[PDB]
């Protein structure tokens, strides 16, 4: 149906290029309106622009007009987005979307899964993982520090420990790198009965780090 | 042209109404009214609920309904449950530019629950590389308003911490908070007692967890 592709990281003032691969039908269909939409982390949805059938019917958000261009490639069944002079305000998840122009066509739309784009001068880097050592209920965790860009995923005991886990939203430090914590609360009597291992996955650097956490 | 929609605390099983107001009439000369409602659950792409004011999209359960006219619209959830928690967006497709409302967050209202508080010293691994991160954890509390105050040798700290909060938990409808105090290795070794003081309406007095360096 729809799948976005992006560069991952773009340096400030440079140009962001995205593509949306369309499947299950031709992008030239007059049944659909195709849009780019974006969402900065923790904020609302913003429409970027859209296209009906071909390049002669493209419209843009006024807030982006003159800085964005959208194009279609019928040979690849793709449409694309080009955003110039990017700032930190352009860091966002970017979605493509397919809307039927009439309920006579069908009664559902389709959203891509979205692709994160981060605008920063920082270098891609996997995290350092430090234990949050415990020392009724006890708490332990992992501090996932100084990585770039988002995201990391944290599982506990290879996914066999999910209840009572809290993985917090990352914070962006003044260094331009991210840091987050993941914790689990356990009965104090559970300390020592089994191992507690956080599995830290940072797909941008293609790195996986396991850290056993103990008193 | 703008659409006007914030948090809604809802007791489970009770109805919820989310309002959307448009600066312009959304009635097209073809007779259709192009206002739609989405729900975005945390960590997911938005899902269409209602199209053209009142029509459910394919597979959308019947506890969702829509109503409205010209500039005023209302989304209704008949009996709110945990799977309805998220942000609800209205959108108009009458004309370009297409536009979204600011969103309305629905959270499950529950009784007050006080946080369990834990403090974590910096690891010896991290101090080797010249930085110390002290972490304070506030676990499974309600409501979301909480205040964390770091104190270093009894002295209040400012500008040297960052915090974040989880989304509402699905089973107990609570929140959790992590706060990190960051200092250089040199500044950390110059002080003794590190404490995080937590104020929350589930407690009768501020709770302080602390440790002595070394």
């Amino acid at each position: 149906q729809l799948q976005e592709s992006g560069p991952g990281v773009v340096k400030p003032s440079e140009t962001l290029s995205l593509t949306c691969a369309v499947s299950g039908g031709t992008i030239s269909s007059g049944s659909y309106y195709w849009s780019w939409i974006r969402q900065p982390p923790g904020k609302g949805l913003e429409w970027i622009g859209g296209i009906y059938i071909n390049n002669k019917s493209i419209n843009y958000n006024p807030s982006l007009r003159g800085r964005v261009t959208i194009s279609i490639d019928t040979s690849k069944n793709q449409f694309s987005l080009k955003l110039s002079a990017v700032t930190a305000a352009d860091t966002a998840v970017y979605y493509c979307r397919r809307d039927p122009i009439s309920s006579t066509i069908e009664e559902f739309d389709y959203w891509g899964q979205g692709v994160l784009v981060t605008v920063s001068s920082a270098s891609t880097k996997g995290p350092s993982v430090f234990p949050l050592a415990p020392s009724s209920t006890a708490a332990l965790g992992c501090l996932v520090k100084d990585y770039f860009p988002e995201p990391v995923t944290v599982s506990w005991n290879s996914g066999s420990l999910t209840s009572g886990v809290h993985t917090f939203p990352a914070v962006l430090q003044s260094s331009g790198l991210y840091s987050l914590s993941s914790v689990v609360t356990v009965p104090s009597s559970s300390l020592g009965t089994q191992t507690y291992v956080c599995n830290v996955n940072h797909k941008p650097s293609n790195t996986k780090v396991d850290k056993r956490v103990e008193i | 042209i703008v659409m006007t929609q914030l948090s809604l605390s809802v007791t489970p099983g009770e109805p919820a109404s989310i309002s959307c107001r448009s600066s312009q009439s959304l009635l097209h000369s073809n007779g259709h009214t192009y206002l739609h409602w989405y729900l975005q659950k945390p960590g997911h792409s938005p899902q269409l609920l209602i199209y053209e004011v009142s029509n459910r999209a394919s597979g959308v359960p019947d506890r969702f309904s829509g109503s409205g006219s010209g500039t005023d619209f209302t989304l209704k959830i008949s009996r709110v449950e945990a799977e309805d928690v998220g942000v609800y967006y209205c959108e108009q497709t009458l004309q370009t530019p297409l536009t979204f409302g600011g969103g309305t967050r629905v959270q499950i209202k529950r009784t007050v629950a006080a946080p369990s508080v834990f403090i974590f010293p910096p690891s010896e691994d991290q101090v080797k590389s010249g930085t110390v991160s002290v972490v304070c954890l506030l676990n499974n509390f309600y409501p979301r308003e909480a205040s964390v105050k770091w104190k270093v040798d009894g002295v209040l700290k400012t500008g040297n911490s960052q915090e974040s909060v989880t989304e509402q938990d699905s089973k107990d409808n609570t929140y959790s908070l992590s706060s990190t105090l960051t200092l250089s290795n040199t500044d950390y070794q110059s002080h003794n007692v590190y404490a995080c003081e937590v104020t929350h309406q589930g407690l009768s007095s501020p709770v302080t967890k602390s440790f002595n360096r070394g």
């Binding site: 009906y52 122009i101 739309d109 | 073809n30």
Partner: peptide
């Protein structure tokens, strides 16, 4: 969305 008034 389902229904795009903008193309009509």
């Amino acid at each position: 969305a389902v229904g795009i008034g903008a193309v009509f």
